[PDB]
Design an enzyme around this catalytic site. Structure first.
Site, PDB file in Angstrom:
ATOM      1  N   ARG A  74       6.390   7.396   0.684  1.00 21.27           N
ATOM      2  CA  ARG A  74       7.449   7.391   0.280  1.00 21.27           C
ATOM      3  C   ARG A  74       7.382   8.181  -1.028  1.00 21.27           C
ATOM      4  O   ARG A  74       8.122   8.957  -1.376  1.00 21.27           O
ATOM      5  CB  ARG A  74       8.399   6.195   0.268  1.00 21.27           C
ATOM      6  N   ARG A  75       6.657   7.458  -1.974  1.00 22.38           N
ATOM      7  CA  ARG A  75       6.537   8.197  -3.352  1.00 22.38           C
ATOM      8  C   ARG A  75       5.319   8.152  -3.726  1.00 22.38           C
ATOM      9  O   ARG A  75       4.289   7.269  -3.354  1.00 22.38           O
ATOM     10  CB  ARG A  75       7.441   7.148  -4.283  1.00 22.38           C
TER      11      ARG A  75
END
Lengths: 279, 279, 279
Positions: A74-75
């Site tokens: 996601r990040r």
């Protein structure tokens, strides 16, 4: 049919040109190259160069500092091949230089993605529940991957749209392919254009006026390494739609009642891609 | 035990015959052949012939006109092997002839599926929440597939029941197999009978009195092409059950409170089959 | 970094020792061996011996009597390799002897798992919504597997913690591996210690202070058969957390509003493991 992947100028679309050709592409193909949308090759390669340097020369400590405690991509950084992911906030950056470059790069991809989605909605006469701008102020995800020297089975996207920039294989092999007209159509790098895939949310919100095509990765050798930048324009959890309308354009929903949200449909975690059923 | 897949006459069951043998089959095996249920071979082959002609000689344009914008295999044509899917409504038909033939064929399969489910419920003393007829007036899906010249890993069904008609391999190879008595038991074509698999919803609604068996596809060669007609009898989203009872017969539910719906359990999209866990 | 999998004494942790080393392990690695936690090798092998005897010499009838009607591996026997599963209730036991031995064995694993989770929570300053003891009085699952003569692709756990006991390969091959420091680190049998994996619920409840590492099974030959005892400490369906906090430590949630439950996130069936995304 013509199994050619067409190209549209975002600027031309915004001026009201090619509206029947655009609508036909959306319904019959659901993918196209997009020019004149703010996404240069020169910029792709400044973002690319700084992340490849990180991948190549970042130490494990530097990589750990920008790795999430759960490996969700996601990040931040993920090592597997290597990935760098970002969104509108909660980002993990290796350095001030990186941050400036990647913030700008993300912004430009988010702006382009919203703009082409706006044109998909306009061309199909679609007003999402709650209006266009609230629909497009959403939950995007960017993933940049390096792949060292078919490799992935066909899937369709569950985004509104997905924007893909690539760098080419040194040996000229074309790895990305999509279903067009029943055929396997190559999707080569274009320095001047981004590839747009329509996803299932485009199909849903427009009441079945947009196709969500399947695509895959072909395997080839020396010089077949590549990168991709994949930007998913994903709706908010509370995006609301008609259940009977969903059923009319192919969605095999198990939803009680007349309206539902994206969260109701997909669940409590985003799902980005989906395969055809074997049952 | 006898690892034989038994055969029951639907008519005989409806007359109250073989009730202990039926209950034992349901608990110990969860699959059987079903005769005398309105499903002839002659009819299977009129439906089969007209869809194979379409698969073989339908042009891409004709195929596109009966293809959903999302490749969900819920309705109409899917090319991958080829599939034709239908349900009670929102169907996509190539032609008036096709429509008449396939509407009749679907109806007969839906009637048979409801009738054998009614007998499963009656044999086990089961009154679904909201009553039998509301439970059986549900969300069926029919999929007809052509396969050109194990091929699929074991799964169980999440239907109430699944009805399967096949055509045989020209070379006599038997591709479908199920777990019976711990063994791999062949499931050959029978011109006179349909194969019935009990699914997990039969287990659930009956409070664990019906087994949901695993099955797979074996690989063999020249003359191994085949077709299948798979009819899933699936509950409505609002089908309601006891959570503690579900936990008692093997369901690994994560459901707060005392009752839940099918939608609560499975989510917002139907899921037709499920594999055993590797964790 | 040191890519060494550390070892902690549960007793020492409970006395307040090694708190910085423990916190660093949790954040940077998310796995460790645990000694002094009530789990002996002698006991593992009494439970192991009686289940292997059952696997080896249990007849099909005896096995059927302790097989669930759906093949979920939640409770009782599963043949595929063979598995024996249990939890706090609704268990299926072959015999009084078995039941006494396995009830004790389960209890000791549940006590150890709660105790090490309590120390994870305490070391990170975490008070779950609704308090510690209600969080730990939860929904555990134990799975014991026999494997006859990489074999499994990397996954992370969705538990709070997962406790793993093994027996070794006769030929000394080490099959379990985890990601540590970017490296593949062997996870051999230790007669004196249990392996603890932190799962994604540890990451979530602690606000990102605990890593959920990926792990896999390597393939090697003569003497490579093995067993494992895998105990998942899983939260209750109504376990409640902050949605913005979840988003801050990597969870790609599609949850409307400010708080959510485990059921909201995962759905209506427990999911024990998860792979990284290919999209």
């Amino acid at each position: 049919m013509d199994t050619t992947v067409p190209t549209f100028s975002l600027a031309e679309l915004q001026q009201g040109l090619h509206q029947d050709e655009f609508r036909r592409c959306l319904r019959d193909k659901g993918l196209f190259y997009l020019t004149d949308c703010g996404l240069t090759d020169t910029e792709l390669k400044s973002a690319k160069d700084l992340v490849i340097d990180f991948f190549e020369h970042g130490s494990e400590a530097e990589k750990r500092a920008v790795t999430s405690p759960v490996p969700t991509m996601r990040r931040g950084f993920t090592g597997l091949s290597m990935c760098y992911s970002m969104g509108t906030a909660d980002n993990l950056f290796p350095s001030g230089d990186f941050e400036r470059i990647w913030t700008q790069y993300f912004d430009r991809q988010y702006t382009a993605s919203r703009a082409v989605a706006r044109e998909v909605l306009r061309a199909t006469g679609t007003e999402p529940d709650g209006g266009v701008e609230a629909f497009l102020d959403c939950e995007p995800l960017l993933r940049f991957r390096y792949f060292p020297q078919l490799r992935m089975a066909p899937h369709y996207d569950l985004s509104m749209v997905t924007l893909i920039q690539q760098t080419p294989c040194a040996n000229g092999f074309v790895s990305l392919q999509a279903e067009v007209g029943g055929a396997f159509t190559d999707l080569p790098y274009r320095p001047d254009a981004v590839l747009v895939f329509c996803g299932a949310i485009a199909t849903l919100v427009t009441g079945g006026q947009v196709k969500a095509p399947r695509h895959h990765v072909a395997a080839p050798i020396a010089g077949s390494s590549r990168t991709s930048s994949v930007f998913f324009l994903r709706p908010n959890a509370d995006f609301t739609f008609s259940v009977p309308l969903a059923r009319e354009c192919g969605f095999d929903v198990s939803l009680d009642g007349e309206t539902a949200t994206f969260q109701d449909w997909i669940g409590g975690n985003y799902v980005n891609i989906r395969r055809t059923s074997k049952a």
